[PDB]
Amino acid sequence: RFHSFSFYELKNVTNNFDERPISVGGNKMGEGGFGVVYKGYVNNTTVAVKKLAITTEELKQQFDQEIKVMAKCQHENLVELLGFSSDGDDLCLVYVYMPNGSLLDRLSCLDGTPPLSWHMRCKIAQGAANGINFLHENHHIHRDIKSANILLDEAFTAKISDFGLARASQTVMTSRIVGTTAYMAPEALRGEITPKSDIYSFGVVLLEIITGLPAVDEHREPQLLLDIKEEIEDEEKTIEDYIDKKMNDADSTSVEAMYSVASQCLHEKKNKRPDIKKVQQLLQEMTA
Ligand SMILES: O=C(Nc1cc2nc(N3CCOCC3)oc2cc1N1CCCCC1)c1cccc(-c2cnc3[nH]ccc3c2)n1
Numbered sequence: 001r002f003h004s005f006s007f008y009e010l011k012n013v014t015n016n017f018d019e020r021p022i023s024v025g026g027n028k029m030g031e032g033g034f035g036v037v038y039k040g041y042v043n044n045t046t047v048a049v050k051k052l053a054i055t056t057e058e059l060k061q062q063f064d065q066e067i068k069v070m071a072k073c074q075h076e077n078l079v080e081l082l083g084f085s086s087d088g089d090d091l092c093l094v095y096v097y098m099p100n101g102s103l104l105d106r107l108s109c110l111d112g113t114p115p116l117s118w119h120m121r122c123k124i125a126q127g128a129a130n131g132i133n134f135l136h137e138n139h140h141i142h143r144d145i146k147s148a149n150i151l152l153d154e155a156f157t158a159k160i161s162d163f164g165l166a167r168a169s170q171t172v173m174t175s176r177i178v179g180t181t182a183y184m185a186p187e188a189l190r191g192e193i194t195p196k197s198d199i200y201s202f203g204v205v206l207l208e209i210i211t212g213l214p215a216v217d218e219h220r221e222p223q224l225l226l227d228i229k230e231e232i233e234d235e236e237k238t239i240e241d242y243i244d245k246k247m248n249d250a251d252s253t254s255v256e257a258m259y260s261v262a263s264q265c266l267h268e269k270k271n272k273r274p275d276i277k278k279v280q281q282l283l284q285e286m287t288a
Contacts, residue, residue, distance in 0.1 A: 001071060003083030003094070010049055010085050010092050013040040017051060023111065030102070033144075033162055034059060039097070046097040047082060051090055062164035063091045069163035073138055077131030079151060079161040098159060100152035103128075103205070107147060107212050109246070118250035120156050121209045125258060126283045127158035132202060133276045135160070136195050141167045143193070145201035146183045146215065147208050167193050182215040182224060187270050196270040199279065203265030210258055212244030229266050232259075257286040 011017060017038055020026025027038040035052040052059055063086070070081040085092035100106060103124060106116055116124070128150050135142055143165045151159045165178050171194045179188055185200035204215050207225050215225045222228065231237045239259045243250060261282045267273045274282070 002067070002081055005083050005085040005092065005094060007085045007088050007090055007092065009042070010040065010051075010094065013042045013047075014038040014049055030105075030148075032148075033164055034062060035093075040094070042094075046099075048095045048097050050093045050095070052092070060091065063093070065166060066093055066164045069140060069166050073135065073140065073163075075131060075134040076157065077127045077134065077159055079159045095161075098151035099154045100156060102148050103150040103152060103158065103208075104147035104214070106152060106156075107208055108214070115212075115244075115246035116156070118247045118254070121247075122254065122258070122283075122287055124150070124152065124156060124158040125206060125209055126280075126287065128160060128205065129202070129276065129280045129283050131158065131160040132198055133280050135166075136198070136276045139169050141169065141193060141195050142198050143167065143188070144179050144183075145198050145205065146180050147205050148180075150205065169193075180215075182226075185270065186268055192270075194270060195276070196273055199265045199273045199276065200267075200270075202279065203262045206258060206262035206265065210239070210244065210255060210262070211242045212246055213242070226266060229263060233263075254286050257282070261286070 014027045018026040019028045019036060021028050022039055029037045029039050029048065032050055035050045038049045038051065040047045040049045052063060067084060080096040081093060082096060083094040106113055109115055132142065132145065142160065144162060149160060149162050151161050153159065171192050173191045174193055175191065177189065177191050181189065183201040183204045185197040187194065188197040204226050207228065208215060213225055216223060228242055232239060239256060243255055261279060264274050265279060
């Protein structure tokens with residue numbers, strides 16, 4: 001199944017887990033839930049190595065869950081686990097490297113990368129929906145769908161990542177509220193666990209893709225991106241006022257169609273949101 005690595009190997013291949021950012025000579029590519037993701041080089045392959053870093057038993061459960069989800073769920077719109085390490089007191093997960101990093105970072109053009117075209121943004125939206133559909137068809141709920149979690153390969157194929165908190169499946173509740181508040185549905189923020197909450201967060205991701213803005217920005221008004229939906233519905237603004245200006249191939253018709261998907265995902269009432277299959281078909285129609 002997955003390759004078993006010993007910690008020593010992964011130390012050696014990451015400049016001993018050099019935590020400086022890759023841009024300044026280290027191996028750190030970013031930080032990712034409850035761990036740091038390092039670049040490694042092993043037997044002709046660049047790999048991503050997440051070393052997990054709030055108790056030990058809970059961290060270990062998240063590690064075991066990541067492994068179980070990935071063993072059951074292989075799909076081109078999900079991240080691929082190559083292996084792991086559990087010997088000693090560290091836990092590592094080793095994945096196929098995604099050379100274009102996160103959607104978040106490509107939206108902000110971090111490190112000077114060129115802006116994504118509308119045509120590419122449409123493919124990424126479709127791919128990400130196809131990943132989430134796969135997960136929901138397999139009765140998993142992700143719980144932290146966001147742009148920082150949609151990775152992008154050499155061809156800008158979208159891959160969903162981070163399954164440490166994912167859950168199997170009738171809407172249950174929890175005491176341990178998890179996710180990222182800027183993306184989270186009202187009912188997730190109160191502790192329900194439902195696939196309908198992934199739909200909502202995807203909504204926010206769709207806004208990010210349209211606008212190029214982050215989901216939250218403390219120095220902006222509104223500080224939360226999901227607030228623009230209300231500005232647009234209460235006639236104060238149009239989707240055209242917010243469309244990312246860093247593209248020249250966006251047409252009104254497809255942009256309005258993606259915004260219409262996003263609006264529907266973002267319904268306050270969970271039972272009025274489309275399910276992922278519907279999102280997927282709408283996103284396919286936007287492009288046809
Ligand atoms: O290759 C991976 N991540 C990655 C690659 C990056 N590459 C780049 N660049 C190369 C070209 O130009 C700009 C900088 O930046 C990258 C950032 C990442 N991630 C992005 C999410 C945070 C972890 C590191 C990768 C592959 C498979 C799984 C994961 C992964 C696994 N678990 C995760 N939990 C939260 C995030 C997360 C990410 N990450």
